[PDB]
UniProtKB/Swiss-Prot annotation, chain A:
The active site is at H128, K155. Signal peptide: none annotated. This is 3-dehydroquinate dehydratase. The gene is aroD. Pathway: Metabolic intermediate biosynthesis; chorismate biosynthesis; chorismate from D-erythrose 4-phosphate and phosphoenolpyruvate: step 3/7. It holds the Pfam family DHquinase_I. Involved in the third step of the chorismate pathway, which leads to the biosynthesis of aromatic amino acids. Catalyzes the cis-dehydration of 3-dehydroquinate (DHQ) and introduces the first double bond of the aromatic ring to yield 3-dehydroshikimate. Disulfide bonds: none annotated. It catalyses: 3-dehydroquinate = 3-dehydroshikimate + H2O.
Length: 233, 230
């Protein structure tokens, strides 16, 4: 059973137009992802505010996507990890996204992830490669190192250059789905990789991301159409 | 691009209306005839004229062996297929393959059909399982040797790997071979193979007119809508 995620990226003052479009799609939204990287000097208090302006029909996921990994967040890596650790104190948050990459300080990441789970927050460790799709063995090894932190979800987004790249991503997710204990989200970007987002559930995937109006990732789809997709497979 | 196939199995007009309704989603109209007792190329011609100009006409005689109903000798079957080449209204003809067949007799029949300007779809179906990737590629290679217009392989997946294997086989073939390829992973588990057929090099995807004869079949109208997304 794939869950449909609706990504919003409001400004401190969460619109009234948006909150209404959200309620309209209540049936297609399992998880509401609140991106916050589009806020300069965003603070945990500001985020806490926005949350209340929302709260119970979907889980609330808060994501600060760094520019390094495709977002707007320019925070220092140090300030980034501090922000992620601080979001644990916001009672209304159900899921928190933490970025993974080769150069991370592993013991520090584990400390933060464990901290988050002690506050009963589901952790989504994610990795984004906008340049290419490593070979299958490499994809599986990335998934392996990420799940070592025992998160609730492991998320891998890669960029395809050919059909085999899409198939390898699907295979890596499918194989992971069959043997590992935590949930997996596999994303092959661009139109070439569309099948991974629509048939995410067929290959063991747990989440599929959509928008309410315009794409927040490689040509996004309205969650309503995405819900229809998940329902088709 | 991917051509959407609409499969029908009549019996020597309510259908005539349902097909015209979905006429915009139909690139090929597969006319299965194996559901008729003692089918003659003459009756086939009678039906075709009653149907037939916005889609190709594929005539398919699926033998019992390969999931159909056709109870013809291999001889009368191969002769039925050879004789279909005389019907001008037919654009494509489906000829079955299976490792034991007479290679030279088959090649003799395929070249024959192509002399009458018919597009040949050499096909193989396994309603029971999906062979390993290597074996899928083996099947494709054998069928490819006859230099047909299309090579078609339908398999029943048991698990996710079986679906990915079919897609992989079809994709790799797509990248090297000089003829069109068609891959089908049956059941709802394999639905993605029909909707994203063109993503992996497929040239034909099969749908229905309204009533499915099993799980995994999609109305050509919905199928066309899905194909259009990729």
């Amino acid at each position: 059973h794939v869950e449909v995620v609706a990504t919003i990226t409001p400004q401190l003052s969460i619109e009234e137009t948006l909150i209404q479009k959200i309620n309209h799609r209540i049936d297609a939204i399992d998880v509401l992802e609140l991106r916050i990287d589009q806020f300069e000097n965003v603070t945990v208090d500001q985020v806490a505010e926005m949350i209340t302006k929302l709260k119970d029909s979907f889980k609330l996921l808060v994501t600060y996507r760094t520019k390094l990994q495709g977002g707007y967040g320019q925070f220092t890596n140090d300030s980034y990890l501090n922000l992620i650790s601080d979001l644990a104190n916001i009672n209304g948050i159900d899921m928190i996204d933490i970025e993974w990459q080769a150069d991370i300080d592993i013991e520090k990441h584990q400390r933060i992830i464990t901290h988050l789970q002690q506050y009963n927050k589901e952790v989504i460790i994610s990795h984004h490669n906008f340049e290419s799709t490593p070979p299958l063995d490499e994809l599986q090894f990335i998934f392996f190192k990420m799940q070592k932190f025992n998160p609730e979800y492991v998320k891998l987004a890669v960029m395809p250059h050919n059909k085999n790249d899409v198939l390898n991503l699907l295979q890596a997710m499918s194989t992971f789905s069959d043997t590992m204990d935590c949930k997996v989200v596999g994303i092959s970007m661009s139109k070439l990789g569309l099948i991974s987002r629509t048939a995410q559930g067929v290959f063991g995937g747990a989440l599929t991301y959509g928008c309410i109006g315009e794409p927040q990732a490689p040509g996004q789809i309205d969650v309503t159409d995405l819900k229809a997709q998940v329902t088709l497979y």
